[PDB]
Enzyme design. Structure first.
Site, PDB file in Angstrom:
ATOM      1  N   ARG A  38      52.478  10.583 -62.481  1.00 15.62           N
ATOM      2  CA  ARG A  38      52.799   9.253 -61.722  1.00 15.62           C
ATOM      3  C   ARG A  38      53.165   8.224 -62.572  1.00 15.62           C
ATOM      4  NH1 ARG A  38      49.398   4.548 -58.933  1.00 15.62           N
ATOM      5  NH2 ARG A  38      50.730   3.700 -57.403  1.00 15.62           N
ATOM      6  N   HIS A  42      57.027   6.396 -62.315  1.00 13.30           N
ATOM      7  CA  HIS A  42      57.146   4.915 -62.341  1.00 13.30           C
ATOM      8  C   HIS A  42      58.048   4.391 -63.523  1.00 13.30           C
ATOM      9  CE1 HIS A  42      53.664   3.654 -59.376  1.00 13.30           C
ATOM     10  NE2 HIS A  42      54.480   4.508 -58.876  1.00 13.30           N
ATOM     11  N   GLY A  48      65.375   3.593 -65.688  1.00 15.35           N
ATOM     12  CA  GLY A  48      65.469   5.016 -66.294  1.00 15.35           C
ATOM     13  C   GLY A  48      64.357   5.082 -66.939  1.00 15.35           C
ATOM     14  N   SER A  52      59.524   1.785 -70.292  1.00 13.01           N
ATOM     15  CA  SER A  52      59.489   0.328 -70.159  1.00 13.01           C
ATOM     16  C   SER A  52      58.024  -0.003 -69.400  1.00 13.01           C
ATOM     17  CB  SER A  52      60.602  -0.274 -69.246  1.00 13.01           C
ATOM     18  OG  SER A  52      60.653   0.428 -68.003  1.00 13.01           O
ATOM     19  N   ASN A  70      51.820  -0.860 -59.606  1.00 14.46           N
ATOM     20  CA  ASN A  70      50.971  -0.558 -60.699  1.00 14.46           C
ATOM     21  C   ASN A  70      49.670  -1.221 -60.828  1.00 14.46           C
ATOM     22  OD1 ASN A  70      53.023   1.228 -61.917  1.00 14.46           O
ATOM     23  ND2 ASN A  70      54.348  -0.308 -62.608  1.00 14.46           N
ATOM     24  N   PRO A 139      59.051   2.600 -54.528  1.00 12.03           N
ATOM     25  CA  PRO A 139      58.926   2.764 -53.122  1.00 12.03           C
ATOM     26  C   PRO A 139      57.417   2.558 -52.642  1.00 12.03           C
ATOM     27  CG  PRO A 139      59.126   4.834 -53.934  1.00 12.03           C
ATOM     28  CD  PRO A 139      59.177   4.017 -55.106  1.00 12.03           C
ATOM     29  N   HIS A 170      52.281  14.793 -54.643  1.00 12.77           N
ATOM     30  CA  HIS A 170      50.923  14.323 -53.860  1.00 12.77           C
ATOM     31  C   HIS A 170      50.258  15.654 -53.374  1.00 12.77           C
ATOM     32  CE1 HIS A 170      53.060  10.171 -52.924  1.00 12.77           C
ATOM     33  NE2 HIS A 170      52.606  10.249 -53.960  1.00 12.77           N
ATOM     34  N   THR A 171      50.526  16.913 -54.064  1.00 10.65           N
ATOM     35  CA  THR A 171      49.704  17.756 -54.044  1.00 10.65           C
ATOM     36  C   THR A 171      48.256  17.884 -54.833  1.00 10.65           C
ATOM     37  OG1 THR A 171      49.645  20.512 -53.940  1.00 10.65           O
ATOM     38  CG2 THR A 171      50.582  19.302 -56.194  1.00 10.65           C
ATOM     39  N   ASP A 222      45.729  15.644 -51.047  1.00 11.50           N
ATOM     40  CA  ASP A 222      45.743  17.127 -50.411  1.00 11.50           C
ATOM     41  C   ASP A 222      44.409  17.697 -50.071  1.00 11.50           C
ATOM     42  OD1 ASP A 222      46.247  19.805 -49.904  1.00 11.50           O
ATOM     43  OD2 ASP A 222      46.961  20.369 -51.846  1.00 11.50           O
TER      44      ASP A 222
HETATM   45  C1  HEM Z   1      58.420   8.788 -52.373  1.00 12.45           C
HETATM   46  C2  HEM Z   1      57.671   7.784 -52.333  1.00 12.45           C
HETATM   47  C3  HEM Z   1      56.296   7.652 -52.780  1.00 12.45           C
HETATM   48  C4  HEM Z   1      55.506   6.620 -52.593  1.00 12.45           C
HETATM   49  C5  HEM Z   1      55.671   5.780 -51.482  1.00 12.45           C
HETATM   50  C6  HEM Z   1      54.105   6.770 -53.312  1.00 12.45           C
HETATM   51  C7  HEM Z   1      52.959   6.169 -53.051  1.00 12.45           C
HETATM   52  C8  HEM Z   1      51.871   6.493 -53.747  1.00 12.45           C
HETATM   53  C9  HEM Z   1      50.382   5.641 -53.511  1.00 12.45           C
HETATM   54  C10 HEM Z   1      50.400   4.386 -52.606  1.00 12.45           C
HETATM   55  C11 HEM Z   1      49.639   6.312 -54.575  1.00 12.45           C
HETATM   56  C12 HEM Z   1      48.025   5.872 -54.561  1.00 12.45           C
HETATM   57  C13 HEM Z   1      48.205   4.707 -55.542  1.00 12.45           C
HETATM   58  C14 HEM Z   1      46.370   4.191 -55.465  1.00 12.45           C
HETATM   59  O1  HEM Z   1      45.695   4.369 -54.443  1.00 12.45           O
HETATM   60  O2  HEM Z   1      46.292   3.177 -56.371  1.00 12.45           O
HETATM   61  C15 HEM Z   1      50.095   7.490 -54.889  1.00 12.45           C
HETATM   62  C16 HEM Z   1      49.783   8.350 -55.806  1.00 12.45           C
HETATM   63  C17 HEM Z   1      50.169   9.215 -56.509  1.00 12.45           C
HETATM   64  N1  HEM Z   1      51.445   9.661 -56.666  1.00 12.45           N
HETATM   65 FE1  HEM Z   1      52.891   8.828 -55.248  1.00 12.45          FE
HETATM   66  N2  HEM Z   1      54.320   7.815 -54.054  1.00 12.45           N
HETATM   67  C18 HEM Z   1      55.795   8.333 -54.099  1.00 12.45           C
HETATM   68  C19 HEM Z   1      56.392   9.395 -54.828  1.00 12.45           C
HETATM   69  C20 HEM Z   1      55.460   9.996 -55.751  1.00 12.45           C
HETATM   70  C21 HEM Z   1      56.417  10.783 -56.812  1.00 12.45           C
HETATM   71  C22 HEM Z   1      58.107  11.101 -56.671  1.00 12.45           C
HETATM   72  C23 HEM Z   1      55.487  11.439 -57.718  1.00 12.45           C
HETATM   73  C24 HEM Z   1      55.917  12.438 -58.839  1.00 12.45           C
HETATM   74  C25 HEM Z   1      56.673  13.237 -59.006  1.00 12.45           C
HETATM   75  C26 HEM Z   1      54.301  10.712 -57.445  1.00 12.45           C
HETATM   76  C27 HEM Z   1      53.007  11.089 -57.910  1.00 12.45           C
HETATM   77  C28 HEM Z   1      52.002  10.653 -57.386  1.00 12.45           C
HETATM   78  C29 HEM Z   1      50.515  11.095 -57.947  1.00 12.45           C
HETATM   79  C30 HEM Z   1      50.389  12.399 -58.897  1.00 12.45           C
HETATM   80  C31 HEM Z   1      49.460  10.197 -57.636  1.00 12.45           C
HETATM   81  C32 HEM Z   1      48.122  10.130 -57.747  1.00 12.45           C
HETATM   82  C33 HEM Z   1      48.063   9.465 -58.942  1.00 12.45           C
HETATM   83  C34 HEM Z   1      46.281   9.356 -59.476  1.00 12.45           C
HETATM   84  O3  HEM Z   1      45.351  10.038 -58.930  1.00 12.45           O
HETATM   85  O4  HEM Z   1      46.019   8.523 -60.601  1.00 12.45           O
HETATM   86  N3  HEM Z   1      54.292   9.856 -56.277  1.00 12.45           N
HETATM   87  N4  HEM Z   1      51.670   7.509 -54.679  1.00 12.45           N
HETATM   88  C1  LIG Z   2      49.827   1.231 -55.033  1.00 20.27           C
HETATM   89  O1  LIG Z   2      51.016   1.850 -54.834  1.00 20.27           O
HETATM   90  C2  LIG Z   2      51.838   1.369 -54.421  1.00 20.27           C
HETATM   91  C3  LIG Z   2      52.135   0.093 -54.006  1.00 20.27           C
HETATM   92  C4  LIG Z   2      53.447  -0.346 -53.493  1.00 20.27           C
HETATM   93  C5  LIG Z   2      53.639  -1.634 -52.715  1.00 20.27           C
HETATM   94  C6  LIG Z   2      52.799  -2.490 -52.238  1.00 20.27           C
HETATM   95  C7  LIG Z   2      53.229  -3.696 -51.632  1.00 20.27           C
HETATM   96  O2  LIG Z   2      54.240  -3.949 -51.476  1.00 20.27           O
HETATM   97  O3  LIG Z   2      52.015  -4.256 -51.140  1.00 20.27           O
HETATM   98  C8  LIG Z   2      54.576   0.213 -53.965  1.00 20.27           C
HETATM   99  C9  LIG Z   2      54.435   1.494 -54.610  1.00 20.27           C
HETATM  100  C10 LIG Z   2      53.335   1.921 -54.977  1.00 20.27           C
HETATM  101  O4  LIG Z   2      53.072   3.307 -55.667  1.00 20.27           O
HETATM  102  C1  LIG Z   3      53.371   7.323 -56.461  1.00 19.15           C
HETATM  103  N1  LIG Z   3      53.716   6.231 -56.860  1.00 19.15           N
HETATM  104 CA   LIG Z   4      61.391   2.726 -67.140  1.00 20.90          CA
HETATM  105 CA   LIG Z   5      47.100  20.973 -54.040  1.00 19.57          CA
END
Ligand code: HEM
Ligand SMILES: COc1cc(/C=C/C(=O)O)ccc1O
Ligand SMILES: [C-]#N
Ligand SMILES: [Ca+2]
Ligand SMILES: [Ca+2]
Ligand SMILES: COc1cc(/C=C/C(=O)O)ccc1O
Length: 305
Positions: A38, A42, A48, A52, A70, A139, A170-171, A222
């Site tokens: 993740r 970010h 890029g 940063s 973040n 996003p 998200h697997t 998952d």
């Molecule tokens: C397509 C749009 C996406 C959105 C809206 C999204 C949103 C989120 C949100 C809301 C969380 C939980 C944050 C927490 O509860 O604090 C999360 C976790 C995570 N995301 Fe995404 N994500 C996206 C794309 C991705 C991509 C492209 C990857 C990596 C290739 C990624 C990898 C992960 C991982 C691995 C976690 C778990 C992190 C941990 O447990 O610390 N996500 N994401």
């Molecule tokens: C916690 O994870 C996220 C939250 C947002 C946006 C939140 C908001 O606009 O209130 C965007 C991307 C994320 O990965």
């Molecule tokens: C996923 N942020």
């Molecule tokens: Ca960057």
């Molecule tokens: Ca899995």
């Protein structure tokens, strides 16, 4: 002009040191492989893959760590510091933080059971952090499929395969109750749960995330294999068991004519998913890199040299 061989003479054991750091941390923090993947995403979506995101606050620019995507969410920063220190000890002033984080993301994926590949290398580190751009570009879980597609295109990933394959991150990993409360109790001001959430899973999730409950409690992305990197994420989507709105929209959106066939293709074959994940990972890793003499090789990932 990135190349996988970039450190083969100057630091041939960089990937091994990165790997050992993650193996060790996983014994006490089973979530760290997911957290690190993740962090790389970010990084790459904000100016890029230039490290940063790793910069802390200064009096002339704010840290991206206070962005909505973040703050009280992104994690793993001390583990990146530890592996950076280990690589710096082995190969001083050689490996950029931007490339370190790219390798750390790949090795995290492999360690959790995913594909193994050599990432392109030779990125350099930014001289500034971009908080407003992080708020603009990352996003959100509440985005519609058109908003998700616009977010990917804005940074340079035009392909629906890019979106669908990279959402496969998200697997594994965790998500806070906060970001699904609307789906469980009052979706888009309807006073009803999101109809694209399977009703048996809905009960389960309400149990974990009650109304008026702890919004920071964590749930697994998952429900099949919470910590293994595999294609089971896509199987869940096909059953209406995506956890967050942006997950399930890949299969259920009115705009999903192009993404549904990708979701099925990846649920149907581990090799098809892994090949696409690698291809999309490397396209994300090629977003607007600093190369050559542009930017720095940072010694401490939190501060400009
Ligand atoms: C397509 C749009 C996406 C959105 C809206 C999204 C949103 C989120 C949100 C809301 C969380 C939980 C944050 C927490 O509860 O604090 C999360 C976790 C995570 N995301 Fe995404 N994500 C996206 C794309 C991705 C991509 C492209 C990857 C990596 C290739 C990624 C990898 C992960 C991982 C691995 C976690 C778990 C992190 C941990 O447990 O610390 N996500 N994401
Ligand atoms: C916690 O994870 C996220 C939250 C947002 C946006 C939140 C908001 O606009 O209130 C965007 C991307 C994320 O990965
Ligand atoms: C996923 N942020
Ligand atoms: Ca960057
Ligand atoms: Ca899995
Ligand atoms: C200097 O530190 C390390 C070096 C290696 C080398 C591995 C190999 O050559 O296969 C592995 C782990 C380390 O922590």
């Amino acid at each position: 002009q990135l190349t996988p061989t970039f450190y083969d003479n100057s630091c041939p054991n960089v990937s091994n040191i990165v790997r050992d750091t993650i193996v060790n941390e996983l014994r006490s923090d089973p979530r760290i492989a997911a957290s690190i993947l993740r962090l790389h995403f970010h990084d790459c979506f904000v100016n890029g893959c230039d490290a940063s995101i790793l910069l802390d606050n200064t009096t002339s620019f704010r840290t991206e760590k206070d962005a909505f995507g973040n703050a009280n969410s992104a994690r793993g920063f001390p583990v990146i510091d530890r592996m950076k220190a280990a690589v710096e000890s082995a190969c001083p002033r050689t490996v950029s933080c931007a490339d370190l984080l790219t390798i750390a993301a790949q090795q995290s994926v492999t360690l959790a059971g995913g594909p193994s590949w050599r990432v392109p290398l030779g990125r350099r580190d930014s001289l500034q952090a971009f908080l407003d751009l992080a708020n603009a570009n990352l996003p959100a879980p509440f985005f519609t499929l058109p908003q998700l597609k616009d977010s990917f295109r804005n940074v340079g990933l035009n392909r629906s395969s890019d979106l669908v394959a990279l959402s496969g991150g998200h697997t594994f990993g965790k998500n806070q109750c906060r970001f699904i409360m609307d789906r469980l109790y009052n979706f888009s001001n309807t006073g009803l749960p999101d109809p694209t959430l399977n009703t048996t899973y809905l009960q389960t999730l309400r149990g974990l995330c009650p109304l008026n409950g702890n919004l920071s409690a964590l749930v697994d992305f998952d429900l099949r294999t919470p910590t293994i990197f595999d294609n089971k994420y896509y199987v869940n989507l096909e059953e209406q068991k995506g956890l967050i709105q942006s997950d399930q929209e890949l299969f259920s959106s009115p705009n999903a004519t192009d993404t549904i066939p990708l979701v099925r293709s990846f649920a149907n074959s581990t090799q098809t998913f892994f090949n696409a994940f690698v291809e999309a990972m490397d396209r994300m890793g090629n977003i607007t890199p600093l190369t050559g003499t542009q930017g720095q090789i940072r010694l401490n990932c939190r501060v400009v040299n």
